[PDB]
Structure formats: C-alpha cells, structure tokens
Amino acid sequence: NALENMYHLFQLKRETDDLEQWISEKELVASSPEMGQDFDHVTLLRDKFRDFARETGAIGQERVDNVNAFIERLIDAGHSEAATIAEWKDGLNEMWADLLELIDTRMQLLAASYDLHRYFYTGAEILGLIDEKHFERDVHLLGVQVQQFQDVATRLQTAYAGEKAEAIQNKEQEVSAAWQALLDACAGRR
C-alpha cells in the first residue's frame, strides 16, 4: 500500500512537471506584442492566433482536468502526502489560469488591431473607387459603401481618443469630402 501510493505520487510528479513545462512554452507564443504591420500582416496574425488559442485551450484543459481529478482521487482515499499534492494542484491551476487570461487579452488586442487596419484599408480603396469616376447609379451604390464606412468611423470614436481617434476622424472626413465632390460633379450632369 505505502509502496504504490508512493508510486502514484511520483508518477503524478512527472505528469505535473511535463504539464507545467508545456504551459510555460505556450505562454512564450501567447505573449508576442506584434499586433501587425498592415491589413494583410494582421489577418495572418489573427487567424494564426485564433487557431493557437482554440487548440491550446482544448488540449490544456483536458490535461489539467486529468491532473486535478487524479490528485483529488489520491486525497479522498487517504494519501500522505495529501498536503504536498494539494499544493501541486493549486500551483498547476494557477499557471493554467494565467495562460488562459494572457491568451485572451492577446485575442482582444488582435481583434482591436484587425478592425483598425480594416478601416484604413477600406478607406484607402474607397478613395480609389471615387477616382474610378473622375449608369449613374453606380455612384448611388458607392454612396452605400461610403455610408457604411462612416458608420464604422462613428463606432470607432467610442473606442479611441488622442492620436488614433484623430487619425480615424481624418480618413472619414477625407473620404466624405471626396465623395461629396463626386456628388457635386454628378448631379451637375443632369
């Protein structure tokens, strides 16, 4: 009895050590501050990370539950050292909770970065579509595109202040100017 409890103790020690190792390596990836260079770069970062987050969560959780469950099994049937493995459980759960919270904030940071880059990419090409003019309802369909971009610019102003908020406001104004200038050209034809 004493012998196989000691045997399970050490075979739990190995697994927990390998889990705690594996967690530390995940967090190295999980904590890149990159955020992206241009709409393309960000698309890759976000897709790549969505995957990494999804996968690390599923696998990690299975592994951590197994270790928690086992540790409680050993405790319910009277193991000594229950005091020592209770500590191991707590120290594992903590590393894990930390990695999940860390993963999450980088999810949201890339979420935010994706949107901002998309906005400017949309604005960059909408201005191209304005020059793509200089029937007469194609303009009336760009008007829908511009209008959506303005709704986007409007929402983002809630999410930003200072240099970034102003930068956003600039492109929306530039675009609106450019669109109206087309409308002054357009109805002036009829």
In short:
Spectrin is the major constituent of the cytoskeletal network underlying the erythrocyte plasma membrane. It associates with band 4.1 and actin to form the cytoskeletal superstructure of the erythrocyte plasma membrane. This protein is mainly alpha-helical.
User: Which percent range fits the helix content?
Assistant: over 70%
* Order of H and E elements: HHHHH
Q: What's the gyration radius in Å? A: 27 Å
Count structural domains.
1
Structural class of the helices, strands and pairings? mainly alpha
Task: Using the coordinates above, name the CATH class.
Answer: Mainly Alpha
Terminal Cα span: 97 Å
Major beta sheet summary: none
Q: Please provide the count of β strands.
A: 0
**Strand content range:** under 5%
Can you describe this structure?
Spectrin is the major constituent of the cytoskeletal network underlying the erythrocyte plasma membrane. It associates with band 4.1 and actin to form the cytoskeletal superstructure of the erythrocyte plasma membrane. Belongs to the spectrin family. Composed of nonhomologous chains, alpha and beta, which aggregate to form dimers, tetramers, and higher polymers. Interacts with BCAM. Spectrin repeats lie at residues 7-110, 114-190. Helix content is 85%, strand content 0%. It has 190 residues and is mainly α. The chain has a single domain (1-190), classed as Methane Monooxygenase Hydroxylase, Chain G, domain 1, CATH 1.20.58.
